[PDB]
Short mmCIF file of C-alpha atoms in Angstrom, two decimals:
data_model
loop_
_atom_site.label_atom_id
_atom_site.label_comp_id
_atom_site.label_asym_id
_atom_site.label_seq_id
_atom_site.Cartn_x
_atom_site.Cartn_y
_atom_site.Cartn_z
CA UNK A 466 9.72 -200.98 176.06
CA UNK A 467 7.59 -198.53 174.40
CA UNK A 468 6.30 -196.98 177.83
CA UNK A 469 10.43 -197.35 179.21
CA UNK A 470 12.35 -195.07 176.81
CA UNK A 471 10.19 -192.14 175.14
CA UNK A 472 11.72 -190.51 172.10
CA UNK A 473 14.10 -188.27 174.39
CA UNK A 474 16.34 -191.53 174.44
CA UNK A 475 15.49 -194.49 172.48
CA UNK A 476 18.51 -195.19 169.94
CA UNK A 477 17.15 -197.15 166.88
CA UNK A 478 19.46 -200.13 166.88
CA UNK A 479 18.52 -201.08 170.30
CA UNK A 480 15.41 -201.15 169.75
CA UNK A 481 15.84 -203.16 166.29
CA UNK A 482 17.65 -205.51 168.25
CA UNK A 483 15.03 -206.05 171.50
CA UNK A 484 12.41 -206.08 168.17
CA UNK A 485 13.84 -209.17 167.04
CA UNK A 486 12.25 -211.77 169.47
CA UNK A 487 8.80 -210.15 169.44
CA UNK A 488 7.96 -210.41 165.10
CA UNK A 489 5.63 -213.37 165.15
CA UNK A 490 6.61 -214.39 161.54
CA UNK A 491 3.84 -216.17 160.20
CA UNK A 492 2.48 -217.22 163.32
CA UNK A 493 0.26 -214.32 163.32
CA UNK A 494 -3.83 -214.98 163.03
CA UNK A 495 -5.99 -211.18 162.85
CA UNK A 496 -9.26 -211.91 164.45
CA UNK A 497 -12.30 -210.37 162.09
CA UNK A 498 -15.37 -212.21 161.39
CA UNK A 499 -13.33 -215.76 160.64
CA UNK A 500 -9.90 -215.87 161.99
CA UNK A 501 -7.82 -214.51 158.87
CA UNK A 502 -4.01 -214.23 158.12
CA UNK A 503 -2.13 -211.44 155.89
CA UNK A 504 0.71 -213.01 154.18
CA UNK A 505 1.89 -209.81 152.62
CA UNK A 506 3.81 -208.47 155.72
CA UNK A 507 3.73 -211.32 157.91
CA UNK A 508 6.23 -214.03 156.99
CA UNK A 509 9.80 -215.55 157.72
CA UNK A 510 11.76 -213.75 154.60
CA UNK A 511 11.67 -210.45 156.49
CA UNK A 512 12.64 -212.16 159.34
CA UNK A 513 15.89 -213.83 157.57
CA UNK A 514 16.71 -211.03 156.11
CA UNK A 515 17.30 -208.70 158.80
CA UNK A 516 18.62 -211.15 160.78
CA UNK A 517 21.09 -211.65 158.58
CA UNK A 518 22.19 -207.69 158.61
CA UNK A 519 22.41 -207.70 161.76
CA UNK A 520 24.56 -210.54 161.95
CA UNK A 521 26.61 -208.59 159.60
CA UNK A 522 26.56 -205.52 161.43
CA UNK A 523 27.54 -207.05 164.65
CA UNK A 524 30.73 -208.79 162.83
CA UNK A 525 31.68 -205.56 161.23
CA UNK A 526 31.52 -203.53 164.83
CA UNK A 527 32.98 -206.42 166.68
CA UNK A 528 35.96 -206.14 163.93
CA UNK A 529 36.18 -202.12 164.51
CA UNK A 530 35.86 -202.02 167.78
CA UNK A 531 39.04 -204.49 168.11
CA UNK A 532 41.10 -202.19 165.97
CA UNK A 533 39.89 -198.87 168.21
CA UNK A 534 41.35 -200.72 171.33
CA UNK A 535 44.53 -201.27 169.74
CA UNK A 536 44.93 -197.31 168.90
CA UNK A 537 43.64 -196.54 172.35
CA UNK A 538 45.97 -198.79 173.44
CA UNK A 539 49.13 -197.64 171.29
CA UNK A 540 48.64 -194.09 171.56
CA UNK A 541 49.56 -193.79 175.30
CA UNK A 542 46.11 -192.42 176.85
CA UNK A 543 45.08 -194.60 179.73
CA UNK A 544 47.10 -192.89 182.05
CA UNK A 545 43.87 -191.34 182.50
CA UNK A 546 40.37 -192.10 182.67
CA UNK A 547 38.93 -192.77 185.89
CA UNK A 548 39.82 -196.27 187.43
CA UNK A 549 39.64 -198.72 184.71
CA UNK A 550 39.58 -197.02 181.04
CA UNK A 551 37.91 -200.69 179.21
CA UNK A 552 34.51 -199.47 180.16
CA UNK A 553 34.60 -196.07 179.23
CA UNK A 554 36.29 -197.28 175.69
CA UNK A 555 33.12 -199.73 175.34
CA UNK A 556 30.61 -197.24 176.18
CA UNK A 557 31.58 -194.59 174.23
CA UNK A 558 32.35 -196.76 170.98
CA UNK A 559 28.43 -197.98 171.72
CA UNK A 560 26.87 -194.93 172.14
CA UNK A 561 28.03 -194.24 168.10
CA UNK A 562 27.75 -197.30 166.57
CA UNK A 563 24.21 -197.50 167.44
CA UNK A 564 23.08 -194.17 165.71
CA UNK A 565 25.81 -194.05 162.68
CA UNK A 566 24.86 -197.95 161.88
CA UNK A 567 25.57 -198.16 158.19
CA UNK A 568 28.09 -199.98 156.04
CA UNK A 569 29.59 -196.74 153.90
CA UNK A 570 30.43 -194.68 157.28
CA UNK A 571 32.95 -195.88 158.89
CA UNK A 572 35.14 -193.09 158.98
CA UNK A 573 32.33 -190.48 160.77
CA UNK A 574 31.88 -193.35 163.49
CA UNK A 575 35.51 -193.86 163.97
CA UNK A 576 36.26 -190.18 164.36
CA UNK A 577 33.19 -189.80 166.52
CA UNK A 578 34.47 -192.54 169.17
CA UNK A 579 38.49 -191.21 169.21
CA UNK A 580 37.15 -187.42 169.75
CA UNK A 581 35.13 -188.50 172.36
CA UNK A 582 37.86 -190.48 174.20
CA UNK A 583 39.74 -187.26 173.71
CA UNK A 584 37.57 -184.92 175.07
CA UNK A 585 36.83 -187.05 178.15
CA UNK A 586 40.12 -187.40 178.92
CA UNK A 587 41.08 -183.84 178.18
CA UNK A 588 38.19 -183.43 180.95
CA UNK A 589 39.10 -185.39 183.27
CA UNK A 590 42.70 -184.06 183.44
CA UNK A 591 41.44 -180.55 184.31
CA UNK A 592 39.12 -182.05 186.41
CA UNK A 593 42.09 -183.55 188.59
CA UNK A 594 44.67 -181.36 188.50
CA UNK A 595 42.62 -178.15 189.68
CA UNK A 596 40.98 -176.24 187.12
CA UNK A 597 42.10 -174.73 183.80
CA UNK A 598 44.61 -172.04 184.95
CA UNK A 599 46.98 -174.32 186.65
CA UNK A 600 48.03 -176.57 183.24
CA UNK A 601 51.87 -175.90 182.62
CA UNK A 602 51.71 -178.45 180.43
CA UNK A 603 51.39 -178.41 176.77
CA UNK A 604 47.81 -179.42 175.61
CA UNK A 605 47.10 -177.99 172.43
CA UNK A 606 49.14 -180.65 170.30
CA UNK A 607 47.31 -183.09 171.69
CA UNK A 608 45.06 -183.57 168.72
CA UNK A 609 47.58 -184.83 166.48
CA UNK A 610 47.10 -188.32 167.59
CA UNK A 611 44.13 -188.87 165.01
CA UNK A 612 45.70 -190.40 161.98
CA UNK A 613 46.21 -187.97 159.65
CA UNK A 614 44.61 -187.23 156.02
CA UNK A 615 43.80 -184.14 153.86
CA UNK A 616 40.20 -182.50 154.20
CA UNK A 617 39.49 -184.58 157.66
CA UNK A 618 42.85 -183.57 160.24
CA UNK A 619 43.42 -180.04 158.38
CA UNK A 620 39.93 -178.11 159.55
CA UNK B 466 73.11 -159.76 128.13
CA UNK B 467 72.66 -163.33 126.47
CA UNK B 468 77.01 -163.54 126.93
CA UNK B 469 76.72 -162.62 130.73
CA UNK B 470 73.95 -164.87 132.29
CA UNK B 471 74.00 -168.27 131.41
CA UNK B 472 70.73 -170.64 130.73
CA UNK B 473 71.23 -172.07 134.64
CA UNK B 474 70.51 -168.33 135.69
CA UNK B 475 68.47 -166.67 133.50
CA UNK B 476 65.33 -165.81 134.98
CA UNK B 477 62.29 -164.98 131.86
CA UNK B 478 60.79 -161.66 133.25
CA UNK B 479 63.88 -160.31 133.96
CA UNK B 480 64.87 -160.81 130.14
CA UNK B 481 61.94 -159.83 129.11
CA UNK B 482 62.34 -156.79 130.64
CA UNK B 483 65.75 -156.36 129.35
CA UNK B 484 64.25 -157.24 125.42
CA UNK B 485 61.61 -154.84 126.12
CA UNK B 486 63.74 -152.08 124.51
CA UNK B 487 66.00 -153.86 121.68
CA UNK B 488 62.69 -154.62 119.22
CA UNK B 489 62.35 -151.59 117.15
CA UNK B 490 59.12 -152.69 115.18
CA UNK B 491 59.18 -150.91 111.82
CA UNK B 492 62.33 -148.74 112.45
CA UNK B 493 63.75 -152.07 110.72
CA UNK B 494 65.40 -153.07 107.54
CA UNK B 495 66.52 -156.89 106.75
CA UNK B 496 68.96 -157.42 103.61
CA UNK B 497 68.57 -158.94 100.78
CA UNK B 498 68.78 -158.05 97.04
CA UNK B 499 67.37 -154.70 97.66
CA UNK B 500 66.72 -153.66 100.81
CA UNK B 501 63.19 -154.70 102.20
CA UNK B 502 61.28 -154.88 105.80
CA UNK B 503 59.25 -157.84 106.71
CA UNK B 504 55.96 -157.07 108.11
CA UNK B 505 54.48 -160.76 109.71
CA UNK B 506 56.87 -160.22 112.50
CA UNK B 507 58.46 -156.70 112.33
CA UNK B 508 54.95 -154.79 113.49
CA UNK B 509 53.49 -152.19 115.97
CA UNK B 510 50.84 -154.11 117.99
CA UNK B 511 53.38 -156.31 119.26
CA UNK B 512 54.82 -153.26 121.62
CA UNK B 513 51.67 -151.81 122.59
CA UNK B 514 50.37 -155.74 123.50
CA UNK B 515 53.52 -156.08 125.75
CA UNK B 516 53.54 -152.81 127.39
CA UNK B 517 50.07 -152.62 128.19
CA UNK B 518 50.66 -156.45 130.05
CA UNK B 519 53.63 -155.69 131.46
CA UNK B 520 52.25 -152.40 133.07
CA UNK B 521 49.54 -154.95 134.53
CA UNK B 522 52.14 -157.08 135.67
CA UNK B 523 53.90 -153.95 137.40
CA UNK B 524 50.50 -153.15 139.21
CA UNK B 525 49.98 -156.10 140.61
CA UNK B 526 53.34 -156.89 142.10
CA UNK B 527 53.43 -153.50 143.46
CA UNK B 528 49.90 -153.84 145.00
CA UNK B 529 50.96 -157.71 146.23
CA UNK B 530 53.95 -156.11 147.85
CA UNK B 531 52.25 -153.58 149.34
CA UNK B 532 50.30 -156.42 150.96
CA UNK B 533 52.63 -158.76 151.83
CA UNK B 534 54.49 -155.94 153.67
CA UNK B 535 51.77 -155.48 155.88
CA UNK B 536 51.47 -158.74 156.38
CA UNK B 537 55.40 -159.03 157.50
CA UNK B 538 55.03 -155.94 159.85
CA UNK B 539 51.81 -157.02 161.71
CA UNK B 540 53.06 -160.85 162.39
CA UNK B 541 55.82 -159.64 164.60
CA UNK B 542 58.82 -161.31 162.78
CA UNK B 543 61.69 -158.54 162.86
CA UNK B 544 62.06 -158.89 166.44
CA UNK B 545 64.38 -162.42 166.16
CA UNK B 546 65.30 -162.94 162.89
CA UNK B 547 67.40 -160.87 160.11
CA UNK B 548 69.24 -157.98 160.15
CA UNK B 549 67.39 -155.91 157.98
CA UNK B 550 63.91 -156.64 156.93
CA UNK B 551 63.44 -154.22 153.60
CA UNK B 552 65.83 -155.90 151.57
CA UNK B 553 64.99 -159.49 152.25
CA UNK B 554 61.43 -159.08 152.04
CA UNK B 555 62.47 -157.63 148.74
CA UNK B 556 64.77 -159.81 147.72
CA UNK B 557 62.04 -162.96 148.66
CA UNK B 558 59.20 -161.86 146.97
CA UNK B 559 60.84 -160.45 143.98
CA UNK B 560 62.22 -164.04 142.86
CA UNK B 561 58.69 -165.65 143.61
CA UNK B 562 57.06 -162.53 140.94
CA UNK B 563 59.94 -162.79 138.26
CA UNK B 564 59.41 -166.46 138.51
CA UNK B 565 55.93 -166.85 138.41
CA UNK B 566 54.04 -164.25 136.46
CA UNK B 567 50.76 -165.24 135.46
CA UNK B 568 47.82 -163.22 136.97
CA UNK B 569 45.41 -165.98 137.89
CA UNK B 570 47.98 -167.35 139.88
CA UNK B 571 48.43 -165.43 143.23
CA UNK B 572 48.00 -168.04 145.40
CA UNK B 573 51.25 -170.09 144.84
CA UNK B 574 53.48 -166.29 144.83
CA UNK B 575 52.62 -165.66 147.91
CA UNK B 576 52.78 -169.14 149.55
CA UNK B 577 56.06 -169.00 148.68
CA UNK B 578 57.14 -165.65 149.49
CA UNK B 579 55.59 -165.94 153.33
CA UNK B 580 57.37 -169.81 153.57
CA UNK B 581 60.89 -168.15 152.06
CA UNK B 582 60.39 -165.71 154.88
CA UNK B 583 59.12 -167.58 157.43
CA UNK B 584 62.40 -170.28 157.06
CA UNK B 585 64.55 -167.48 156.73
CA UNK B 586 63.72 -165.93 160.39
CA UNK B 587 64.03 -169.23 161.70
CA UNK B 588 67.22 -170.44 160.05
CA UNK B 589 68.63 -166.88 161.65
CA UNK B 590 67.42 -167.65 164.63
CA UNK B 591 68.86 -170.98 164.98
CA UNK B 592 72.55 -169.88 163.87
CA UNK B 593 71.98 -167.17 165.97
CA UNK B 594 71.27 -169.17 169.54
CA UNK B 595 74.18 -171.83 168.54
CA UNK B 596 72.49 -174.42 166.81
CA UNK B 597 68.91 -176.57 167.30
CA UNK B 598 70.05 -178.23 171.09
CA UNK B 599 69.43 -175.09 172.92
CA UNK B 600 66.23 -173.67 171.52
CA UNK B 601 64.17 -173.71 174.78
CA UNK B 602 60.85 -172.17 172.68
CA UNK B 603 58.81 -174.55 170.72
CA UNK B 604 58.67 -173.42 166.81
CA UNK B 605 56.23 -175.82 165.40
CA UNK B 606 53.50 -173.83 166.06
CA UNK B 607 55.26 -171.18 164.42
CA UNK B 608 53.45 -171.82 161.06
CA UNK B 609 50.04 -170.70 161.89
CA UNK B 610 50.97 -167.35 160.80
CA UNK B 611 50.03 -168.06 157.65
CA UNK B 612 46.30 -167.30 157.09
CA UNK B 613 44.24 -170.42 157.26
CA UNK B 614 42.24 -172.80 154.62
CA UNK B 615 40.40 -175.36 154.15
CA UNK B 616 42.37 -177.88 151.79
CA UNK B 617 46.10 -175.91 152.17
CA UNK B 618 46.78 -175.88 155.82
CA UNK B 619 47.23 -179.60 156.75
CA UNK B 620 50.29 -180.27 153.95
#
């Protein structure tokens, strides 16, 4: 892993999560003169306990991620996005909720994932129809599909 | 004055400008067994206090004005809209400064002078083109003529 992904591109709850099978526990041994064990960093309550986050974590995204596909859904956008629009929604919902990963922040994740949909849509549109000078449609208002609040959807 | 405007339209600066000139001060005399002025609220500081405000008051609305006329000339509005532009700009911001007077409060005057304005023009321009099912243009964006903020601009 280490010699895979340098620090260009190695997002810290993957690698939390491939960590998770390699922590010995207490089944650790630190060869010196006579085979010794440290039991101050090397035992099974770190272990429960950040298995236990994680659970958490993965419940809470699992739960958010269901409500994102609903707006997506709703709000009448997969008439584009390439040939099937489920993948792109996955990937860019998990390229945010593995940076942004605590409990307090949902709403910067959530906003993250439905301006990226946006924006790669937007894309893609322009993309297909011929460049940027050919759009007689209206674009502009597009943005007002975010739900709405008062120092988030004004600036 | 107090026969012929009633409490339902009586606006305060307007009386107060009216009252500015019927309060002698100590040219005064109040009846009794021998004729005798009262002092505690028969005095001279009382006029120069109110004068020297409401010259403030008169230097602000005039700078304001001269402002908010700017404002109405740059924003191309008098092309559709009323008939003549001098007397209801006027008119508009004239009720918002006899209504609202104090001087740390310039924000909400003009807000409503520019949104009297702006729903003026577009009233016009609707009973001008026979009524809201033929009004090709689209008028929503029509409020970003107001200057932008922060916290005041999603409302």
């Amino acid at each position: 892993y280490a010699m895979d992904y340098p620090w260009k591109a190695s997002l810290p709850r993957i690698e939390t999560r491939l960590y998770l099978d390699q922590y010995g526990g207490s089944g650790d041994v630190w060869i010196g003169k006579v085979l010794h064990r440290m039991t101050l960093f090397c035992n099974d309550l770190y272990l429960k306990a950040a298995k236990a986050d994680f659970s958490n974590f993965q419940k809470e995204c699992r739960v958010e991620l269901n409500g994102l596909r609903r707006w997506y859904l709703r709000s009448n956008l997969e008439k584009f996005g390439g040939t099937d629009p489920q993948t792109t929604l996955m990937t860019s919902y998990f390229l945010a909720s593995a940076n942004i990963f605590e409990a307090n922040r949902a709403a910067e994740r959530l906003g993250w994932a439905r301006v990226a949909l946006l924006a790669d849509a937007v894309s893609s549109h322009f993309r297909r129809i011929g460049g940027p000078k050919n759009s007689t449609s209206n674009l502009e208002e597009l943005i007002s599909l975010v739900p709405f609040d008062d120092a988030y959807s004004g600036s």
